[PDB]
Each structure stands twice: as structure tokens, then as C-alpha cells.
Amino acid sequence: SDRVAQLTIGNSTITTQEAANIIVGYGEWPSYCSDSDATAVDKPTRPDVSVNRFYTLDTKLWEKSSKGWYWKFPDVLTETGVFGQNAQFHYLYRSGFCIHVQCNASKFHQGALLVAVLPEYVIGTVAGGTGTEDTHPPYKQTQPGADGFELQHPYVLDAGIPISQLTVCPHQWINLRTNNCATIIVPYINALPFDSALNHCNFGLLVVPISPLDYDQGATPVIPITITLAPMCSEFAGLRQAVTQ
Amino acid sequence: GDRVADVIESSIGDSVSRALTHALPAPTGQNTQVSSHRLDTGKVPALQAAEIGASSNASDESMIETRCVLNSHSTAETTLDSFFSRAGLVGEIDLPLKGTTNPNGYANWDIDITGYAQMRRKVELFTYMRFDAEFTFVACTPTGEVVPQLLQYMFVPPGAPKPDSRESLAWQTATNPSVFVKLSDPPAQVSVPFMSPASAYQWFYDGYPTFGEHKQEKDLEYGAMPNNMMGTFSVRTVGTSKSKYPLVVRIYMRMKHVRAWIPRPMRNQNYLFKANPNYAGNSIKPTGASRTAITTL
Amino acid sequence: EIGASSNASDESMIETRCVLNSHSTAETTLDSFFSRAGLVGEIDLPLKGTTNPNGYANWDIDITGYAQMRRKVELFTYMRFDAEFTFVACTPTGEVVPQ
Amino acid sequence: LLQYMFVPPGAPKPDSRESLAWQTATNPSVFVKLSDPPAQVSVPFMSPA
Amino acid sequence: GFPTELKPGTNQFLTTDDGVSAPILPNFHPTPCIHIPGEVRNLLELCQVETILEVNNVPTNATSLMERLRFPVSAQAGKGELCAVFRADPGRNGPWQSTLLGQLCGYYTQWSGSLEVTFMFTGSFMATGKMLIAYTPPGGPLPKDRATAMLGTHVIWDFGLQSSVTLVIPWISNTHYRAHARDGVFDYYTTGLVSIWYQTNYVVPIGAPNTAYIIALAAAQKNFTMKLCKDASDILQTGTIQ
Amino acid sequence: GFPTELKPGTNQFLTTDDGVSAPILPNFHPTPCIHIPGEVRNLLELCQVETILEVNNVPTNATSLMERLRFPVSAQAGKGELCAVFRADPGRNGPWQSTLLGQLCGYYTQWSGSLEVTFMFTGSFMATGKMLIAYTPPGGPLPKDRATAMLGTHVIWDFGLQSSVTLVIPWISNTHYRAHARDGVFDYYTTGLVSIWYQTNYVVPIGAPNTAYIIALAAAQKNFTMKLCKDASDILQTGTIQ
Amino acid sequence: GFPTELKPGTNQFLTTDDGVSAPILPNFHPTPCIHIPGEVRNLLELCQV
Amino acid sequence: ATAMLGTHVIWDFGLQSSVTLVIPWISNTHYRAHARDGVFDYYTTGLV
Amino acid sequence: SHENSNSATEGSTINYTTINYYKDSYAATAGKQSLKQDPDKFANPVKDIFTEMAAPLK
Amino acid sequence: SHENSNSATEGSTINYTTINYYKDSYAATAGKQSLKQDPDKFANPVKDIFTEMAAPLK
Numbered sequence A: 001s002d003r004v005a006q007l008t009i010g011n012s013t014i015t016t017q018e019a020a021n022i023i024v025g026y027g028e029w030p031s032y033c034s035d036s037d038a039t040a041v042d043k044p045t046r047p048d049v050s051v052n053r054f055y056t057l058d059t060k061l062w063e064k065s066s067k068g069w070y071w072k073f074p075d076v077l078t079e080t081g082v083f084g085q086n087a088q089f090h091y092l093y094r095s096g097f098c099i100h101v102q103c104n105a106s107k108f109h110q111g112a113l114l115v116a117v118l119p120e121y122v123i124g125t126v127a128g129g130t131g132t133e134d135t136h137p138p139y140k141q142t143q144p145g146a147d148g149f150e151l152q153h154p155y156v157l158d159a160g161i162p163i164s165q166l167t168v169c170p171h172q173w174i175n176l177r178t179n180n181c182a183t184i185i186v187p188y189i190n191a192l193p194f195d196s197a198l199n200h201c202n203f204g205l206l207v208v209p210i211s212p213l214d215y216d217q218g219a220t221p222v223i224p225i226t227i228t229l230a231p232m233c234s235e236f237a238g239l240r241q242a243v244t245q
Numbered sequence B: 001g002d003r004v005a006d007v008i009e010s011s012i013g014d015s016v017s018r019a020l021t022h023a024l025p026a027p028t029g030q031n032t033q034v035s036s037h038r039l040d041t042g043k044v045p046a047l048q049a050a051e052i053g054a055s056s057n058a059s060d061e062s063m064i065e066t067r068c069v070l071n072s073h074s075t076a077e078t079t080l081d082s083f084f085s086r087a088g089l090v091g092e093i094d095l096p097l098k099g100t101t102n103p104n105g106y107a108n109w110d111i112d113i114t115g116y117a118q119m120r121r122k123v124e125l126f127t128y129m130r131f132d133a134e135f136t137f138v139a140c141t142p143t144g145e146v147v148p149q150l151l152q153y154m155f156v157p158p159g160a161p162k163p164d165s166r167e168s169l170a171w172q173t174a175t176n177p178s179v180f181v182k183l184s185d186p187p188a189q190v191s192v193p194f195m196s197p198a199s200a201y202q203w204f205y206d207g208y209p210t211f212g213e214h215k216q217e218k219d220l221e222y223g224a225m226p227n228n229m230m231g232t233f234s235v236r237t238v239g240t241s242k243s244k245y246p247l248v249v250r251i252y253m254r255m256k257h258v259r260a261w262i263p264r265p266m267r268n269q270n271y272l273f274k275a276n277p278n279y280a281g282n283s284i285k286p287t288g289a290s291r292t293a294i295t296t297l
Numbered sequence C: 001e002i003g004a005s006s007n008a009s010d011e012s013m014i015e016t017r018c019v020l021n022s023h024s025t026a027e028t029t030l031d032s033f034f035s036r037a038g039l040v041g042e043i044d045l046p047l048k049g050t051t052n053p054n055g056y057a058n059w060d061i062d063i064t065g066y067a068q069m070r071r072k073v074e075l076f077t078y079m080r081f082d083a084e085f086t087f088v089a090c091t092p093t094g095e096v097v098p099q
Numbered sequence D: 001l002l003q004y005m006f007v008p009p010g011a012p013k014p015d016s017r018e019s020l021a022w023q024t025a026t027n028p029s030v031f032v033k034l035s036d037p038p039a040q041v042s043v044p045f046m047s048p049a
Numbered sequence E, F: 001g002f003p004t005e006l007k008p009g010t011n012q013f014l015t016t017d018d019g020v021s022a023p024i025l026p027n028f029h030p031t032p033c034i035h036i037p038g039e040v041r042n043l044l045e046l047c048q049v050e051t052i053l054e055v056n057n058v059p060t061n062a063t064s065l066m067e068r069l070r071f072p073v074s075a076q077a078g079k080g081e082l083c084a085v086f087r088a089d090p091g092r093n094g095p096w097q098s099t100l101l102g103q104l105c106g107y108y109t110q111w112s113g114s115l116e117v118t119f120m121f122t123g124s125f126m127a128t129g130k131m132l133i134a135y136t137p138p139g140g141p142l143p144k145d146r147a148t149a150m151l152g153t154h155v156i157w158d159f160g161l162q163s164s165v166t167l168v169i170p171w172i173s174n175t176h177y178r179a180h181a182r183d184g185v186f187d188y189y190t191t192g193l194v195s196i197w198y199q200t201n202y203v204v205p206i207g208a209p210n211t212a213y214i215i216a217l218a219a220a221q222k223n224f225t226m227k228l229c230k231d232a233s234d235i236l237q238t239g240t241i242q
Numbered sequence G: 001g002f003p004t005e006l007k008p009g010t011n012q013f014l015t016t017d018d019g020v021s022a023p024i025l026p027n028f029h030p031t032p033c034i035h036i037p038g039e040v041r042n043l044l045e046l047c048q049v
Numbered sequence H: 001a002t003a004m005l006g007t008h009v010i011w012d013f014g015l016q017s018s019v020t021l022v023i024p025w026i027s028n029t030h031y032r033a034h035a036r037d038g039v040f041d042y043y044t045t046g047l048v
Numbered sequence I, J: 001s002h003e004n005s006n007s008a009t010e011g012s013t014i015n016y017t018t019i020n021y022y023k024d025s026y027a028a029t030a031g032k033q034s035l036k037q038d039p040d041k042f043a044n045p046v047k048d049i050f051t052e053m054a055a056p057l058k
């Protein structure tokens, strides 16, 4: 009655029988932009059901040696479905998200993933190793698209900050003996009312194993982690031709 | 007019951000209530489920037998203004005589406070910050000496002409704000408003400032937020002839009327460059001290 | 041809939303634009000189010698105002002497 | 020109005229010239007792 | 005396400080102020007045400077050809510098609001035509054809008794204010592009000129404001003014 | 003029002085503040959020840093063996430095309040066990055996559906506030020790891993406050930052 | 500014002057004062012992 | 990824042995005749 | 206070709010002006005003 | 007084008590903030809140 759940939005429904409640980031639900916070004058388009629905984008395999991965929002969706089209045809975009990370095993497997949302997740580089070279991460590392990207140094989140404190951000854990999914609702976070879905990623989603995956020889060894997410309260403005970047 | 039911009953457009929590006044630390033994089934405060994402709700009272304690310890010093409204060094400007850098008697400093670790680490605890500020300028010779020299400081916002010499026409300063002060006078001090085109300054911007292909050569622009670029601070010795003395101007900033949003993990690796989180990959250190065994102190 | 500027507004050219604009117009008042001190005169008092070697100088009050200030006031034909004059003195190297 | 800084227990004590600790982003410091009158400040009761 | 203590800032001269200074002529009363027409109260009053936009900012020789004030249209091939393009950034180098709005804009670091460009056709009475004027919000590259331009905000103009048409460049920005845009990271603040295309064709009967000109007038809408007063990018003097 | 007399302190620049300074931009109004989620008002709000405590602060090579975030338990010999120990001092070098609480703590000279550490078991569903977690107030040396540990404040943890348990480190001090403890006379302010013992044993059936990990999360209770704002012990830069 | 005129005594440091000085720790609240036996209020109390 | 763009249900195995997929009536016509290969594919319901 | 009406703006249709310490008002600060505007004086000085909806020349 | 509402905190849900001598409010002192806190926003942002006495997962 807290372990069981159904998430229905658009023409999509998700079920889980081993949930751990739901986190609503920073304690607030997604909402549309008010007439006082807004600044752009054109009437926005709010496609509703055609874009606020669940999209299943990627599956990673959790191995005994995995380091962890991250995805950037709204980047993961800019090329998918009606949402993508809207993000490409409009200069301005804004929306919240319902993120549902899935991972099931058996009562004989073990391990724990930390699933967190970090706003303005700026990636850093190792500065040539010695720290004398002012290098920058390439586009494919900053905006990895649906495939996501693997962390090189999880302990410092590839940005010189401690993953040990990442729990100060909206998060849940997928501890195999307890649950098989994490659900996080995120409101629109930014210092502007609307922004570009292409040039700016509002937050990053991190899925990192903190207690390594383990099991005895003979138990199913392929343990996938699937990422499903749904935009919420999507709004677009500043219409022109489609642009991919 | 609306007539089909799904349109009438829809919530499309609700501008009110439904909030699950609210602030309570808390001027002092919470008190402790008397508690006694509990020998019960069903009630289990000690057991938690960290997977949910929330912190433990268990309190002293439910884990041990407590006495009553009236806690009058104040929470005032941990407010944002208390923590941040303390002037710290954010810039140093050199004006040497015989020099490689500024031998021309003037200098231009792009306003960026991420050059000093103490101040930087503190503001980077948050993602967005909005505030006013008090800037203080401490000038002297490199030995800490005070000399009878007159200086001009000018604030050059983006788009205004940056001076290119001690005699630039831009020093006419008919519109930009300038301060004329002697080294012999106390440090100059002024108040600055919140100037970003955005509702807040943001120490982290996961994006690019422009559209286009983001090829290797324009990767130095990843993370560049023009909304944080307030302009240039220019200083010159006020004369048509070179000054007789080498100078140093140290800039201190004291934030006030502060608001902050989205806390984040605090920096645990040395900083290397201004406004960029690069760290030395070969020298990744633990966040803190280490020991030989987990069963030993 | 009439001589007036267009009366067309956003609302009539495209479908607009409602926007509550609280952006202030205060910084564009005449006092905001003009009440900022700018350089309008420089007077030299050299020792060994061609110009003022006699220890005094006379300056006919005319502020049109410096382009920044001049261009701003010339945006209007007539202007009426009070003024605050500030005199900054030093040696040519920017030094301060007991004089 | 001098700088006086109050370093509470646990804050880094400067080890040179150029110590990074003089950035004084949180500790209180007073900058004053010898030519100025004596610097003067008020201090509260600070003991844990 | 009364105990005081001097604080930092003491003795400094801040050019924008609004203080009180001793009056030099005690009991002096100024000449009365008679009524003078045309008093202005706010620079914004001036920003709403249309001035000529030099869309044709190409000729540079003294004898041809007047040609910058107008651009042409003439009979085409009916392939929806391009007539002209320009950036809509009002405080950026380019066409807008010819306007009073653009110049006033130069004294402010940030601006916000909608703009408008009114185009006046000055061909003969017997000339007809339909043009498509488009505004492409940020992110959209210069439209390659009319079909691409047509996807943005636009106006289809029909020549007739009303000589002019107004294209509104509505405020469509991510931020509440834009700083002046320029090449580089500040392109983040670009307003976008304006392009003019032939919707049909410039048609004329026998006896009327095959080429005519259009004059563009630009100004700001009533939601326009500016902030963070600064010095203009130009200083109109070379040496000392004598 | 009005008779005044300057007092000591005149002309000094005290970095923490809360004064009034001349404004550089008269009549300037800032960009409005829209609604942004996650506003924080007091650092204490953050101190109540649990972050990972590196009880296992031993591995130091870059490739093993992640191992500091969790420690193990595995089948034993039933002799009430010791699993781990650590000091409870939140602002002292050691495990707590990994926590946000510990870091924030570094900006304050004194603190007061109860702490809490929540331990999450991440073994398989089929693994069971009972652990005894003890807090030894000041003066008590590191417990040599479980019987000695058991004499202090403690919790006996049973593995089951609820993956975690919370150990409260109640505020038991002679003084109202403690300064940061460290080796030497400042050990006067030590909080004490936390030790974890096997109450029964880690038991598992055939087919399940013999070793599992525990993750520790720490934060402060609602009676926690800090005072006497100071600079942190670390300065994260070596040379100038370019 | 407001017209003032400095008087003799200006800049002097009189050790017995009871003035006001800038506080170094804004918003700092001291440890509460518990009850302690034997408080004395006036040296005269001691002179009678 | 392509399938996911239509109406769907994500099923999690657990105590409740079953899940229901609803094939909602999404048709251009009020009624469909029986679909079969050929022009009557006009009445096809779709794919699962 | 009780000073002279020396200010360059005495008799202005917009009122200011200033500070002063001298008997002459022109010594006072610039203060805050009143925020009125009349764009029409320059942008629409036509004798017979025309609507937005109408054809300007009929 | 009669100044401008320039402060970075104008429109804050907590009121400050400050000192100022200029027409621009951002020139004012930091003053005293209001002592409200909302730990739950970060420490307990769950949709369906659970009690201290209950078993968190049922």
C-alpha cells in the first residue's frame, strides 16, 4: 500500500509491486508558468497528452564492476516523439518530469543503486591529469543523448564534488532486497521562466552503484537497468523552423 | 468558449505550484521532552527505509529515556546573510612600473569572483544566488606602504568602451560610475545592486551560450553563462605621466540581502581554473583523513 | 506619410498570452540619465611652460570640449538644470602634494 | 597598512605574510593604517561555558 | 563634540553619488521658466518614435550615403525570391545604428520589449505587389527559402492605398532582459532575424518604373524599457576639441 | 558646522561590519525574482539531510575510493565479534568529513545537539542478522568486547523488510556547546565512540553471497545548532587559480 | 553631506572612555548563563567580610 | 523504442500474477467490419 | 523646512522628493522624479487621431 | 522613509529590519533576517508521508 503503485499519464501506464514511495523534488509539483513570471509575449502551445507521457529510452547492464552513468534532461528526449519535434521547432521550452528507473533481480541477488537528480550538472575534465591543461569536455560528454554516459570518476561525479553528499538532491535508492524501482518527480528548475531545450540541460539523472552487484554462480547474471521518463506540464513558445542544435 | 468535457475538466494551465512543505519559525534549537520505557509491538521508530529518499524521523525521545531540556540555543548565526555577509578577497590587481603585465598605468579586470578558493567554495554550496553587495577597495604599494597617489576606479558594463590606456577618452566617465580616491584615504566602498538579466546568478550552467555545432574549438564555451558576466572593473593612476609608485588593489566583496536555491555537494578537490570545475585527474584525493583499519582509531 | 508612428501592437499581429510586466521605467528619466558626473574641463598649471607659467589660469566655462558629455546634452535643444561641480586636483603623475 | 584577523579554534592559522588564510572570507579582519587612530571593536562573550 | 567614527568610503568621490553640496550663490533666484513646447520626461518617450532604419547599409562613399536610407524591389521571376535580410538586435552594430532607438539603446546595458518596423512602399500608384516579411526567433538560421522563413512570425504585405505595413518583432526571450548582443558568447542575447521575400511579384503596367524603393522606419513598442545606464560604445572625438 | 569628535575605530575596515555604502546605480531596479524551487533559508535545514558517512575511510588509491562509501558484514564465529568503530565527533578529521554536516560544521567554531546515523543493510533478501550498535559517551575507552560496549547507549538491530536502523547519538555533554575536538587538550570536547558488534551472526542459505555491505547515512537532530562563524580548515587551491 | 566640525579630543584613545565599537560577530548569541552561586555585585560587599 | 511510442503498459511481476492491457477503441469509424487482407484492412485494429 | 525656492525645477508638473541642509533649494539632491510620460507628443501629433483598426487614410 | 524598492530581497516571504541613508534600498545594511526553516523540503520530500512509529514500508 506503499510498495505497490501505478503511474498513468498520456496513453502510458507503469506498474510496480516493489516500490518505495515517491519523491517530489524540493517538495513541489510541476506547474505551468504564471502570467507574472512569464516574459515572452506569444501564446504558448501546451500539446498535453501527445508529449506528457512515458518514454522508455535506454537499458544499461549492471555488472559487478560498473561505475555508474548519467543522462541530461531534456537532452535525452530532444529527438524522440512529439516532444522532440516540439523542442526542435520552438526556441522556448519548459516542463517538469516524472522519472521511473527500473531494476529487478531475485531474493538471492544484492546491491544498491543511488538514483539522484542534480540540477545544472556541469561536467569537468581531469585537466590533462597533471592539472596544468585547461581542457573542456566534448559535446558528446556534456549532452550524451539517450545513451547516457559512463562516469569516469564516480567518487567526484566527474566534477570535483563528493558523491557522498549527492543525497542532498532529490533521490531514492534501489536496494535489491527492498525495491525494484525509483520514482522521482521533478519540477522545472531554472533561473528563467523558459529556456532552450537544446542549449541548456536543466538537470542530470545519476544512477550509481554504491553497494556492488553480487550473486552466486548460476543465478541470472544479466541485470538490466531501464530508464523511463515523462515530461509533465510541457510548454513551448517562439516558433520557427526545426533545429537540432 | 469550451464545450467538450475533457477541455472543461482539464488542468492545463494551472500556474499554482502545489507545495508539499512549508516553513515554520525556528529561532532556537528544539527542546527535549521527558520520555519513558516503551515495551511495544507495532511501534518501531528505530526502523527506517532509507531507500525512500528521506532522512530518519527517529528522535532522542524514542530511542532512550530522556529528561526535559529547555533549549534556548539560537539559530540566528546560520542564516544565509550571517554566513555570507562577511567581506572576503575576490580580486587582486597589480599596477607595476617596470613590468611585463600592466606597465602602462591602468588595468582592466573582468569581474569574476571564482579566482579565490575561500569565497568560491562557500557560494558554490548553492546553484542559484541572488543578492546585493558591498565592494571595498584596499590599495597600497607591494610592501603595504601608503603613498600620496590618486586613483580612478571605473565600472564598465558590457558594451561600454573598455579603456586601452591611462589616457583613454573613456575615463571621461560621463555615464559609467567612477570613484576617485587617494591611497591615503580609507578604502573606497560602494553598494552594488543585483544586476543579472536573470532572476539569479548561477555558479553552474550545464549548457552552451549559443546555437550551432559544438566542435572542439568552441568547447571552451561550455558552461559560459553571459547572465553572470557583469562587466569590467578598470583602474588607472590619474595622470598624463607615469606614476612614481607600483600599486596593488585588493577587492573585497560582502554580500547582503541574500537568497539562495538548490544546495549541492561541496567542492572536495582543489580548484584549478576560474568558472570551470576541472580537477587534477592524477591527484584525486579522498574528501577527508584516512586510517589503517576500520576496527581501529 | 501622416507623420505618426505605427499604432499596431503585439496583440493585434500575433496570438499573445497575458504577461504582467513589472519592468521599471525609472532609469530612463532625465535626472537618471544626466545626474552622473562627467569630465567637462581640464586646467593645467605648469611650472616651466608655454601656456600658464605664471601660477594662475582662466577657463571660460564651456562644457562642449569633451565628447561624452557633449553628445548626451546635445540630444535636446533646450535644457534647464542645477549642477554640482567637483574639482579634482593633483600633479601630472597623479601625485598629491601639500599645496 | 596592516591586517588583523581573528582566528577561532579550528580555523587555519596563517603561516606566512602570504598565507591563503588572509583571504578572510569568513573570519573577521580589520584593515587599518598606522596613521589612522587605533582600531577598536566589540567582542561578545564567546566561551562554550 | 558628538562622538562619531569614520567609515570606509570616507573622502571618496563617486560620480553617481546623489549628495548635497554647498550653494555658491546664497538667495539667488533663477530666471522664471516660461512655457516651451516639446518637453520630454523620459527617454522611453523617444524610443517610441520611428526613425529610418538603414537596411541597405552597404554603400560607403560620401556621394552614396543617402542610398542607405532605402532599399529596392522590382519585377522578379516568381520564384519567391529573397529581397533583404537583417538582424533584429537593436543595440548591435548594423542597420539599427541609424535609428534613434539604437543610439539611445547604447546608453543602457540591458533592454526588454517588443520592437516594430514599419515599411513604406514608395513606388508609383500603378505598382502592385505582395511581400512576406518574417521574423525568425533565436536558434533559427537565416532561412534558405521562403518556405522556411514562413514557419516563423510573419506578415504578408499587400501594396495599395495604405502605403505601409508594420512588422512587430514580439518580445520572445528566455530572459526578462537582454544585454547587447554581439559575436561571441553574447550571441546568447540575440533577438533573431528579419527576412523579406516576394510573396507574388512586383507588377507594373507599361509606362511605370520597373524599380521602386522601400523605406523602413523602426521604433519600440509600449512594453519596452531599458536598464543599467552606461556609456555609449562611441566617443565622437579624435584629439582634443578646440 | 555641527560639533563632532572622532573616536577610535575611525577609518578602519572591519570585514564583518554591517554598514551602509553609497549606491553606484541610482534608480536602478533589478530583474524581478521568479519562483525557483528549493530555496534554503538556514544552513541548519541542510544539516538535517543525511549524507554518506565514510566509516570505511581506509582505501586511498583512486580506483578504490568508492569502497570508502560502504563497509562489510559476513558470516562469523559467533563470538560477538567487532565489526567497526569510529569517533562520533562531527567536526573532527575522520569519517564525518565525507558528510555535508561535517563540512558545514567546519564553518562554525562551536556546535550543540544530538546526531543520528542511519545504517542501511544492502545484502540479499535471504540474509538475516542482528547487530549491536553502541555509543560510548566521553571517558569510556574503546570497548574491548561487546559486553563492555553494551553498557553504553545502544541499539540492537534486526535485519528484515525495513532495510535500515537509526542510532541516535544523544547530546550528552558537560558544556552547552562543544568546540571542534582534536588530539590534545581539545579532546575535552570529544563526543565519544561508536562501535558495531555482531549480536548473533550474519546468516544466509545456500545460494546467497557470504559477504554484504552496509551504508551509513548521517545527519543532525532538530536540537542541533552551530555558533561562532569561522573559516573552514581547508583551502582548496594550491597556487593562483587561472 | 551634513555640516560637521571636528573638536579637540578627536582621534584620542582614552582608556576609561565608555563608547560604542563595531561588533565583530554579527548575530552571534552567547552561551546562556546558568545559575552560579556567589555572584558579587559591588566590591563593598567584600569589604564587609 | 518504437513500440514504446504507442499505447502501452509496463508490467512488473509480483504477488499479483496478472496485468491487463486495454486496447482502447481508437477508430475513424463508429463501427469496424471484420478486417482481412485487402481493402478491408481499412478496418484493422492494430498490433500488440 | 524653511528655505528659498531656488531649484531649477520649482513649478514643475512632476514633484520630486529630495534631501537638503542649506537655505537654497538648488543645493538639494536630485531625488526621485515622477514617472509620467507622453509619447504622443512626439509619436502621434496628428490633428484628427485615427484608430488602430481603421485604414489610416480614408 | 521614501526610497526605491531596489533591494535584491524585495518580495521575500521573510521580512528584514535594516538601516539606510540613500534613496536606493540596495544600499541598506544586511539587517536581521526572519528565523523560519523548512527542513522537510530537503529531508522529507515524500508524496505520502509516513509516521515515526510506523514501519516505513508496508
Ligand SMILES: Nc1ncnc2c1ncn2[C@@H]1O[C@H](COP(=O)(O)O)[C@@H](O)[C@H]1O
Residues within 6 Å of the ligand: B024, B025, B026, B027, B028, B029, B030, B031, F222, F223, J037, J039
Ligand atoms: N526543525 C526545527 N529546528 C528547531 N526548532 C524547531 C524545529 N521544528 C520545530 N521547532 C520548535 O518546536 C516547536 C514546535 O514543536 P512541534 O509542534 O511538535 O513541531 C516550535 O515552537 C519551534 O520553536
Ligand SMILES: CCCCCCCCCCCCC/C=C\[C@H](O)[C@H](N)CO
Residues within 6 Å of the ligand: B111, B112, B113, B114, B133, B135, B153, B154, B155, B177, B178, B179, B190, B192, B201, B202, B203, B228, B229, B230, B233, B275, F024
Ligand atoms: C566603482 C566600481 C564598482 C565595482 C563594480 C562591481 C560589480 C560586481 C557585480 C557582482 C557580480 C557577482 C559575481 C558574478 C559572477 C561570477 O563572478 C562568475 N562570472 C561566475 O562565472
Ligand SMILES: CCCCCCCCCCCCC/C=C\[C@H](O)[C@H](N)CO
Residues within 6 Å of the ligand: C061, C062, C063, C064, C083, C085, E024
Ligand atoms: C567656485 C567655483 C564654481 C564654478 C562655477 C561653475 C559655473 C558653471 C555654470 C554651468 C553652465 C552650463 C554650461 C553652459 C553653456 C555651454 O557650456 C556652452 N557655452 C554652449 O555654447
Ligand SMILES: [Cl-]
Residues within 6 Å of the ligand: E089, E090, E091, E092, E178, E179, E180, E181
Ligand atoms: Cl541588442
Ligand SMILES: [Cl-]
Residues within 6 Å of the ligand: F089, F090, F091, F092, F178, F179, F180, F181
Ligand atoms: Cl567535533
Ligand SMILES: [K+]
Residues within 6 Å of the ligand: B028, B029, B030, B031, B070, B071, B072
Ligand atoms: K526551543
Ligand SMILES: [K+]
Residues within 6 Å of the ligand: C020, C021, C022
Ligand atoms: K505594467
Ligand SMILES: [K+]
Residues within 6 Å of the ligand: E019, E020, E021, E022, G001
Ligand atoms: K558635498
Ligand SMILES: [K+]
Residues within 6 Å of the ligand: B189, B190, E007, E008, E009, F019, F020, F021, F022
Ligand atoms: K561605507
Ligand SMILES: [K+]
Residues within 6 Å of the ligand: D040, D041, E005, F007, F008, F009, G019, G020, G021, G022
Ligand atoms: K569605537
Ligand code: NA
Residues within 6 Å of the ligand: B044, B045, B046, B047, B048, J051, J052, J053, J054, J055, J056
Ligand atoms: Na519508523
